[PDB]
């Protein structure tokens, strides 16, 4: 099937482009229902949770904002008190009350019932011995006026001293008064947020587990000091939320204690539904960020997010990436976020990463790389690839098939040379399975077929050259000239059906770039899987060329449908292609049976 401009247009129409946008900020976690409901259960249950999702989602910002709206009962006073001259314990009294116990004690069970042991060991023997006893006053760590918002402690740098506190040494000697608190102490009564990656990098996971499982919170000591203070464990009063990518957790998840300690998974989706409601939420969010946003600017950014997702019906959920693009656009718009400033910011990003493609197109233009984008040839096709370096530019890859009389072999030269990956190899085997099983009249196939990419790659992976390879092969067998103005992309199964491929937009745009650089003929285009219709979010220039009749997109479901377009004839209605393929096989069989 041909895809008209009308079927290919995916962009949002813009009315009153320059009108200033005016919209309230959406709630935290908008379109992230799963993750919010998980966090809500963790908050209600007092459970530890982990926030998981790809980078640049704004996971941290969404979390802090959400936690800012909670209300806990006011955090107790938290303090170290000595139970001895070499022992200390962590204590909580009700809020405000430690300042009285400090004034009382500065008077070198009075009304502090819960602070019993510290007084009950504060006794007497200065008199009985005359022994000079000044390291007996309590050390307040924290205190707070209200539990709204609760304590919220984000420590991105999860070293032992930042988590557990420190011992300073004055000249050696130390005492209760010299114990500095850590993030764990500051988060009591509220929330501690750490990054999974930091716990691994800093090697502090095992100690963190000990803090949560056993209440062991050990202020960091130095290798020098002649002695140290013993620190009693204490009941940990906090909720911990870990943040990281799905891969960051996997190191931690191989430890059964992680599953045990962190029961609630709060997972962010990498895409949201593409809806009026999420476009509107994006608008409100951007305005709250400080952007001066026009309607057309909002619309362009919304469509760029759809395109980032390579889905017409979904939008990229990475708000931090949308923001960063918006920041560039704002500079290009003189402070104003407009349709033009967005398009131009997208175009400047491609320009900044274009050197490699400029080098490539120049080599093609000079004939150092040999490409044909017009005319016809037997056993040759332009397949499409992406280079495995960011930003993953698409390019045509010329591919040839040669047939000889022989004993049923389909060879990939690139695979035999050791250049192809496992899935690439699977694609070749699959084509072999299709041809053997399709053409059985002579017994086993009377041909050997060798496939080669015309340029040499360090490696090729993926299955999406399968369609190009199968059409090349059929063409070589049938002696069928194929159009070189149409590139071909598609994986194939053993039954000759065409399956969806990755990076479809890059692939299509890369052939168009090559056609444009060599001069558009008016008949060029791409054949691609019908299964990829939902992924097509082509750039303006390609859509305009297709609307102009200068470029053409064809969607197929079977390998034969591709071959028909390429060879300019039907399989049947015979004089069709199928009888020419059969005629080729009979010729090869006769040569092979001397």
């Amino acid at each position: 099937m041909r895809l008209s401009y009308e079927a290919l247009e995916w962009r949002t129409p813009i009315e009153n482009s320059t009108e200033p946008v005016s919209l309230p900020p959406p709630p935290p976690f908008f379109g992230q229902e799963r993750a919010r409901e998980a966090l809500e259960l963790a908050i209600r249950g007092g459970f530890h949770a982990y926030l998981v999702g790809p980078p640049s989602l704004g996971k941290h910002e969404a979390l802090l904002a959400y936690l800012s709206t909670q209300s806990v009962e006011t955090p107790p006073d938290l303090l170290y008190v000595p139970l001895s001259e070499r022992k200390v314990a962590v204590l909580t009294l009700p809020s405000g009350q430690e300042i009285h116990l400090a004034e009382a004690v500065e008077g070198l069970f009075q009304r502090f019932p819960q602070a019993r042991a510290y007084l009950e060991a504060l006794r007497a023997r200065y008199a009985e011995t005359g022994e000079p006893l000044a390291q007996w006053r309590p050390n307040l760590l924290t205190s707070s006026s209200s539990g709204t918002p609760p304590p919220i402690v984000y420590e991105p740098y999860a070293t032992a001293p930042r988590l557990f506190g420190r011992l300073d040494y004055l000249v050696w000697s130390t005492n209760v008064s010299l114990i500095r608190p850590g993030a764990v102490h500051r988060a009591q009564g509220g929330y501690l947020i750490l990054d999974a990656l930091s716990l691994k990098r800093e090697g502090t996971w095992e100690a963190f587990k000990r803090a949560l499982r056993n209440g062991q919170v050990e202020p960091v000591t130095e290798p020098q000091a002649p002695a140290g203070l013993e620190v009693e464990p204490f009941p940990i009063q906090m909720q911990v939320i870990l943040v990281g990518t799905p891969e960051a957790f996997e190191g931690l998840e191989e430890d059964p204690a992680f599953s045990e300690l962190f029961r609630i998974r709060a997972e962010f989706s990498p895409t949201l539904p593409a809806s009026p409601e999420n476009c509107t939420a994006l608008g409100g969010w951007l305005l709250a960020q400080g952007f001066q946003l026009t309607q057309g600017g909002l619309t362009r950014l919304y469509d760029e997010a759809r395109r980032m997702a390579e889905q017409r019906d979904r939008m990229d959920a990475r708000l931090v990436e949308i923001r960063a693009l918006a920041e560039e656009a704002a500079v290009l718009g003189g402070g104003l976020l407009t349709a033009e400033s967005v398009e131009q910011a997208i175009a400047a990003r491609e320009h900044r990463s274009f050197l490699s493609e400029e080098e490539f197109l120049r080599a093609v233009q000079e004939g150092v790389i040999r490409l044909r984008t017009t005319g016809r040839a037997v056993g040759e096709v332009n397949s499409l690839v992406v280079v495995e370096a960011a930003p993953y530019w698409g390019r045509p890859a010329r591919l040839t098939a040669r047939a000889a009389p022989g004993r049923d072999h389909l060879i990939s030269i690139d695979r035999e040379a050791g250049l192809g990956g496992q899935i690439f190899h699977k694609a070749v085997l699959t084509l072999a399975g299709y041809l053997r099983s399709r053409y059985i009249e002579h017994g086993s196939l009377p041909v050997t077929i060798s496939l080669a990419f015309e340029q040499n790659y360090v490696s090729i992976e993926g299955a999406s050259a399968g369609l190009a390879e199968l059409v090349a092969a059929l063409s070589a067998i049938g002696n069928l000239p194929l159009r070189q103005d149409l590139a071909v992309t598609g994986a194939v199964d053993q039954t000759g059906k065409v399956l969806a491929v990755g990076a479809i937009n890059a692939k299509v745009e890369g052939f168009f770039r090559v056609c444009k650089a060599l001069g558009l003929s008016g008949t060029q285009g791409v054949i691609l899987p019908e299964a990829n219709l939902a992924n097509l979010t082509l750039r303006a220039e390609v859509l305009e060329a297709v609307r102009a009749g200068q470029f053409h997109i064809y969607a197929v479901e079977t390998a034969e449908q591709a071959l028909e377009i390429l060879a300019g004839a039907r399989m049947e209605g015979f004089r069709g292609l199928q009888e020419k393929i059969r005629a080729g096989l009979e010729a090869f069989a006769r040569l092979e049976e001397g």
Partner: peptide
């Protein structure tokens, strides 16, 4: 170049 089909 390393590539992906």
């Amino acid at each position: 170049e390393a590539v992906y089909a």
